[PDB]
């Protein structure tokens, strides 16, 4: 059928940038919204921005604005994430989920409807 | 501007219904219809449980419905079973463009 | 109650014919005369936009 996955885990220190991939399979990808939500061990879910696929257009929520990069890649159905200047706090796993459809007359960004999810990323940093 | 409240954690008997409720910000919840539930086994990833306020998707039997009454959204759950131990969340349309995820309620069986 | 829109084609808001449509023009033999046509049934129209 469909499926969303991911890259293997990675160790990065203090200070430098994570790469996380997410591959999208089976179906159009560049008429779905794809958003990304992080988990810290024990906590619940924190929701980072989403990216829309066909412009390339981001949105990035509070207290991340400034330190992530959304970019896509069409040809090669792959959506990439760019999070520099890492901290001990962010030590979480990370999903990639698809949102609502792209519609050209209404704006479903924003709506919280993640079907398929990505099996997760785990970064630890030390 | 901080995440929707939620209790801790909550129990019940087999065959007997439970409510998980959410209270929001008026921006939040009291004003967009844009209510989603979220249940995850633990070491994996989280499935959709309701679209709207109220909505079933396929694949997901008749069990849970939800509904909203001001700014508080509820979740009933009907016919617990050993299949219930799982971690709900709410999320909701915050304004915008921006999504917000609550905080996590664990039920336990009996 | 005459209501003054501004509107090229497609006239908007206003008071509909009585019981069939009704043609207005002034001569209907030269081409450079803009013939009216008076409806009896309203259509709907909505319009939208984005979020500044
Ligand atoms: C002015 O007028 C214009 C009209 O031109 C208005 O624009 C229209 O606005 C409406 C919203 O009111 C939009 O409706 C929405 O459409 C989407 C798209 O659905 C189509 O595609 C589905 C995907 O399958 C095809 O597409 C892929 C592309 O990659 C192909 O690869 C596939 O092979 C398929 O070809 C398809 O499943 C849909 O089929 C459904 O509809 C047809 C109708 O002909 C039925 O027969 C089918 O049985 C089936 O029911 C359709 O072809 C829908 O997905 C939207 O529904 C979602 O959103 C709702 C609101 O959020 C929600 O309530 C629904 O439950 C549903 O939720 C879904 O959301 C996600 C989508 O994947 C998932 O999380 C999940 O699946 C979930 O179920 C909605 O119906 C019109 O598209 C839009 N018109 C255009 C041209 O864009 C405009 O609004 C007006 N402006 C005003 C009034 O101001
Ligand atoms: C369309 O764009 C407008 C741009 O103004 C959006 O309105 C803004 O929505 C946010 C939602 O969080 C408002 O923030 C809130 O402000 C109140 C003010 O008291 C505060 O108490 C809350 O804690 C929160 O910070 C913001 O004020 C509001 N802008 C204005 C001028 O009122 C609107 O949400 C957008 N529409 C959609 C559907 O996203
Ligand atoms: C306009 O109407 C008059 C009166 O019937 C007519 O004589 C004249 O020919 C018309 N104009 C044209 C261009 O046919």
């Known amino acids: 059928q469909v499926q969303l996955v991911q890259s293997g885990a990675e160790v990065k220190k203090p200070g430098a940038s994570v790469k996380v991939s997410c591959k999208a399979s089976?179906?159009?990808?560049?008429?779905?919204?794809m958003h990304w939500v992080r988990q810290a061990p024990g906590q619940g879910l924190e929701w980072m921005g989403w990216?829309?696929?066909?412009?390339?257009?981001?949105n990035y929520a509070q207290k991340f604005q400034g330190r992530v990069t959304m970019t896509r890649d069409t040809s090669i159905s792959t959506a990439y994430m760019e999070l520099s200047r890492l901290r001990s706090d962010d030590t979480a796993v990370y999903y990639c989920?698809?949102?609502?459809?792209?519609?050209?007359?209404?704006?479903?960004?924003?709506?919280?409807?993640?079907?398929?999810w990505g099996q997760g990323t785990l970064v630890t940093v030390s | 501007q901080s995440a929707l409240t939620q209790p801790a954690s909550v129990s019940g008997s087999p065959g007997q219904s439970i409510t998980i409720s959410c209270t929001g910000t008026?921006?939040?919840?009291?004003?967009?219809?844009?209510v989603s539930w979220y249940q995850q086994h633990p070491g994996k990833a989280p499935k959709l449980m309701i679209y709207e306020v109220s909505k079933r998707p396929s694949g997901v039997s008749n069990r849970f419905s939800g509904s909203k009454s001001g700014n508080t959204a509820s979740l009933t759950i009907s016919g617990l079973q050993a299949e219930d131990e799982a971690d709900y969340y709410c999320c909701s349309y915050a304004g915008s463009s921006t999504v917000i995820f609550g905080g996590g309620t664990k039920l336990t069986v009996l | 109650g005459i209501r003054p829109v501004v509107s090229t084609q497609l006239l908007l808001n206003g008071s509909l014919a009585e019981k069939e449509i009704v043609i207005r023009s002034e001569n209907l033999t030269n081409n450079a005369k803009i013939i009216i046509v008076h409806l009896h049934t309203p259509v709907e129209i909505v319009c939208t936009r984005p979020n500044n």
């Open positions: 008026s921006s939040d919840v009291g004003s967009y219809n844009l």
């Open positions: 089976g179906y159009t990808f560049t008429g779905y919204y």
């Open positions: 989920a698809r949102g609502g459809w792209i519609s050209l007359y209404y704006d479903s960004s924003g709506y919280p409807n993640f079907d398929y």
């Open positions: 990216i829309n696929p066909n412009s390339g257009g981001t």
